Swiss-Prot record, chain A:
Gene: S
The protein's role, per its UniProt record: Precursor of the fusion protein processed in the biosynthesis of the S protein and the formation of virus particle. Mediates fusion of the virion and cellular membranes by functioning as a class I viral fusion protein. Contains two viral fusion peptides that are unmasked after cleavage. The S2/S2' cleavage occurs during virus entry at the cell membrane by host TMPRSS2 or during endocytosis by host CSTL.
Disulfide bonds: C31-C53, C36-C42, C297-C308, C347-C391
Part of the full-length chain shown: 708 to 1143 of 1273
Protein's recorded name: Spike protein S2
Effect of Q219H: In strain: Omicron/BA.1, Omicron/BA.2, Omicron/BA.2.12.1, Omicron/BA.2.75, Omicron/BA.4, Omicron/BA.5, Omicron/BQ.1.1, Omicron/XBB.1.5, Omicron/EG.5.1
Swiss-Prot record, chain E:
Function: Subunit of the fusion protein that is processed upon entry into the host cell. Mediates fusion of the virion and cellular membranes by functioning as a class I viral fusion protein. Contains a viral fusion peptide that is unmasked after S2 cleavage. This cleavage can occur at the cell membrane by host TMPRSS2 or during endocytosis by host CSTL. In either case, this triggers an extensive and irreversible conformational change that leads to fusion of the viral envelope with the cellular cytoplasmic membrane, releasing viral genomic RNA into the host cell cytoplasm.
Gene that produces this protein: S
Domain of life of the native organism: Viruses
Disulfide bonds: C34-C45
Protein name, as recorded: Spike protein S2'
Length: 408, 117, 95, 97, 48
């Protein structure tokens, strides 16, 4: 209706999770060894096809270097390695579930341990350049910088600030006044701790939470298995194994059967390489998205809607996972709204008054000025209102009275 | 009654010797790639070699080191940690450091800091 | 058909229309609120005042010029309909 | 010049349009039937080529599932179905179009 | 010959599907930021 407004009276601190894959396994299939490993006649015929055995290796090498670059660009975004102080009194907030646990030999956190636990015919698998310990070290440095500094450690020199004051700054950045935090510090701390515990329980209970990483692993494994199975096929020749081709036949027929086998195997290898290139492009897009979220959600406070979570973004925490990253987005959601009667302006002395920052509301008999995201009514005053024109142009102006502090 | 073993990909991985009935395992002969690590001919002509996915003993035969990547030959393994210059892999990096030689070490992720909180 | 078949979409066009209608109703009646929590009502004039307040223009600009702004918005929507009905090459990407 | 500015005195409310595709048609061509509908010797010969007929179907099925996911993630973004009030006096604005 | 034609068709369809997925991601982002809120990014939700 044209005069009714709903304003919240309570809030809720919620934590959501988002999982993004950043890299995949670095395989490499040798061309000649796959098509025919021990034969020499087959190699001599294979030289007749030019450089079909260099393009494939070049493509796979490019893919592997791309995977290393993806991990590098996502996680290595901090110049230094920050450490949390041994004294851990952060005003009531409890980061035990995300901070590293020194008791474990791996030095991974609780949630990171849960995440890691839940998840030749001429082919080789290279090891990643960054070991999982270094990935955990990056994530720990980012967490320590976020908790201790704020957003300052990603835009210059890290500057310390009490965590309660950092939370006050972050409320001030979504339209809620600082005094809301300081008067409800214990309630907000309890809500945050409960939300973190619920995240741990939800991750531990359901096994199908990490769908994307398992999907990537399964796709790669199925592709490699299909290639290996395809290695044993006739492709129109008398037999798949070429020892029977070369032992039971004269040079002409053996040569033609070997050529048929070579063509079939080369086609299979080309198909595998093409699908690997497409999959690598998709993974690179995902890694670019993950790097953007690390820059904007973790190192700062984004105003983009539905980017860092579901609600009004407060902050985010990164966690590692096998071939991927997990963001825990802490957001603010209103609750317990109430109806009120509202007016555009107020006519006091023939002049219209508009709120500086806020909105006019009413019990039903009196008029107050309040915020927009929290119900904190206060008396209308010349301090928090400004004048513009007379009381004839505004449609819906309400006759009432204002107060002036310069009347003791 | 079982003579030979086939795996998940249908490749034979075991045979029973016919005369003495002992189960034996077939493991493929070593194969891999060879990489050359150089600091560029604009500075020196001394290189190192990396044999990928191969135990140092099986390499056909300066200083030999085993890493997860494979067998490095010609580089001296220091105990310190610097910023990565040439990435060998598995957390191992190589560089050209002073007489003057190619060293191999483990990566350093950056300076250690502690904000006064 | 020589062995080629076309599967139907999982969502019918009526359901897509229902989604877009819900989005429009929420935007007109609520504003930002319905996308970040519980939906809260607010008069559309005050919603437009809030939206001017976000680009650097004071609220009183809207209230003192409400009729002119409403007329401009309506004329713009009508011209959108005319322009879409005029040229058949506007929908080039889907085609 | 180092002491002059330009400041507007009026405004204009302008509406523009932007068109974005979100999905394509879900087709799934059968492998063997396309190559040879009825011939049996053709099927027997094709069986010697291994799994060149299952990979294509797998790829096409993945594409179709992806199209459904595209539409679902673009449009399904409201938890409840909101409805406009029967009275449509919005302070002078006209949304009937 | 027919197998080669089918392979070519499937590869082209895969590339086209990747392009459409990129466009659908852009459309979802614009729905999230322009419709459900008010964006300060220049030239994202229109011109002005
Ligand atoms: C805002 O909501 C919180 C809960 O989210 C309220 O706090 C609860 O209050 C009840 C009643 O006293 C207690 O039984 C619960 O234990 C409280 N929960 C927590 C987490 O503290 C809070 O009272 C609400 N705000 C107002 C003004 O009522
Ligand atoms: C932060 O939360 C953790 C987890 O709830 C607390 O750790 C618990 O501490 C109690 C008493 O020391 C133990 O009995 C529990 O087994 C611990 N739980 C876990 C999961 O380790 C921790 O005490 C909290 N921090 C503070 C300062 O209270
Ligand atoms: C209108 O607002 C006033 C101000 O809060 C409310 O009046 C107060 O009511 C409480 C509860 O009885 C009293 O303790 C205060 O002394 C009242 N203040 C004044 C200035 O009278 C009033 O309740 C509101 N109207 C309605 C319908 O709730
Ligand atoms: C095949 O011949 C070998 C050699 O004679 C047999 O090996 C001997 O088996 C007997 C019976 O167990 C042992 O006492 C001897 O010590 C074995 N000789 C050696 C050198 O180890 C073998 O058993 C025969 N197998 C069959 C199936 O006939
Ligand atoms: C701002 O622009 C609007 C629209 O161009 C002006 O309103 C027009 O005024 C002329 C002159 O009287 C009329 O002929 C038109 O019919 C009006 N258009 C509309 C849509 O009402 C308005 O006068 C301008 N304001 C200033 C201060 O220049
Ligand atoms: C909103 O605009 C539409 C169209 O511009 C108005 O619908 C017109 O109403 C008149 C009044 O009888 C008819 O003569 C026209 O034929 C209608 N046009 C169309 C396209 O339907 C509608 O009346 C406007 N809203 C209000 C509240 O007046
Ligand atoms: C506000 O008033 C409407 C009038 O029908 C009612 O439906 C709604 O429940 C009220 N709001 C609350 C929070 O009760
Ligand atoms: C609200 O609309 C009613 C008609 O439904 C009208 O009588 C009243 O004056 C309007 N009030 C404002 C502030 O627009
Ligand atoms: C407010 O003042 C105006 C002008 O003095 C008057 O017309 C109007 O009736 C007053 N409001 C009420 C509720 O009487
Ligand atoms: C390097 O570390 C190893 C591991 O303990 C040790 O045996 C060796 O003596 C060290 N060398 C130097 C020069 O410190």
């Amino acid at each position: 209706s044209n005069n009714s407004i709903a304003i919240p009276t309570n809030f809720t601190i919620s934590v959501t999770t988002e999982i993004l894959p950043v890299s995949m396994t670095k395989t490499s299939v040798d061309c000649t060894m796959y098509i025919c490993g021990d034969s020499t006649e087959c190699s001599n015929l294979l030289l007749q096809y030019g450089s079909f055995c260099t393009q494939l290796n070049r493509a796979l090498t490019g893919i592997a270097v791309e995977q290393d670059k993806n991990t590098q660009e996502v996680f290595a975004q901090v110049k230094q390695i920050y450490k949390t102080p041994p004294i851990k009194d952060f005003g009531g907030f409890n980061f035990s579930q995300i901070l590293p646990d020194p008791s474990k030999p791996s030095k991974r956190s609780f949630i990171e341990d849960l995440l890691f636990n839940k998840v030749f015919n001429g082919l080789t698998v290279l090891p990643p350049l960054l070991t999982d310990e270094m990935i955990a070290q990056y994530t720990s440095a980012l967490l320590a910088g976020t908790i201790t500094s704020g957003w300052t450690f990603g835009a210059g020199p890290a500057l310390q600030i009490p965590f309660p004051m950092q939370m006050a700054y972050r409320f001030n950045g979504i339209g809620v006044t600082q005094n809301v935090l300081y008067e409800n510090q214990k309630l907000i701390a309890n809500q945050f701790n409960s939300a973190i515990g619920k995240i741990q329980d939800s991750l531990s209970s359901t096994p199908s939470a990490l769908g994307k990483l398992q999907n990537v692993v399964n796709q790669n494994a199925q592709a490699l298995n299909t290639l290996v199975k395809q290695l044993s096929s006739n492709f129109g020749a008398i037999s798949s194994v070429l020892n029977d081709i070369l032992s039971r036949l004269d040079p002409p027929e053996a040569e033609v059967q070997i050529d048929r086998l070579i063509t079939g195997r080369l086609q299979s290898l080309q198909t595998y390489v093409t699908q690997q290139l497409i999959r690598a492009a998709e993974i690179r897009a995902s890694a670019n998205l993950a790097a953007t979220k690390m820059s904007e959600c973790v190192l700062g406070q984004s105003k983009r809607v539905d980017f860092c979570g579901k609600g009004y973004h407060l902050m985010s925490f990164p966690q590692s996972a096998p071939h991927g990253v997990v963001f825990l987005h802490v957001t603010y959601v209103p609750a317990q709204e109430k109806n009120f009667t509202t007016a555009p302006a107020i006519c006091h002395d023939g002049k219209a008054h508009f709120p500086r920052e806020g909105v006019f509301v009413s019990n039903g008999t009196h008029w107050f000025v309040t915020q927009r995201n929290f119900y904190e009514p206060q008396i209308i005053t010349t301090d928090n209102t400004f004048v513009s024109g007379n009381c004839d142009v505004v449609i819906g102006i309400v006759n009432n009275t204002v107060y002036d502090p310069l009347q003791p | 009654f079982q003579q030979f073993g086939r795996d998940i990909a249908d490749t034979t991985d075991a045979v029973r010797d016919p005369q003495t009935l002992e189960i034996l395992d077939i493991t493929p002969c070593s194969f891999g790639g060879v990489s050359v690590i150089t600091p560029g001919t604009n500075t020196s002509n001394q290189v190192a070699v990396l044999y990928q996915g191969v135990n140092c003993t099986e390499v056909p035969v300066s200083n030999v080191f085993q890493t997860r990547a494979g067998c490095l030959i010609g580089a001296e393994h220091v105990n310190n940690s610097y910023e990565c210059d040439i990435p060998i892999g598995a957390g191992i990096c190589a560089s050209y450091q002073t007489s003057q030689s190619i060293i191999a070490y483990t990566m350093s992720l950056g300076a250690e800091n502690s904000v006064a909180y």
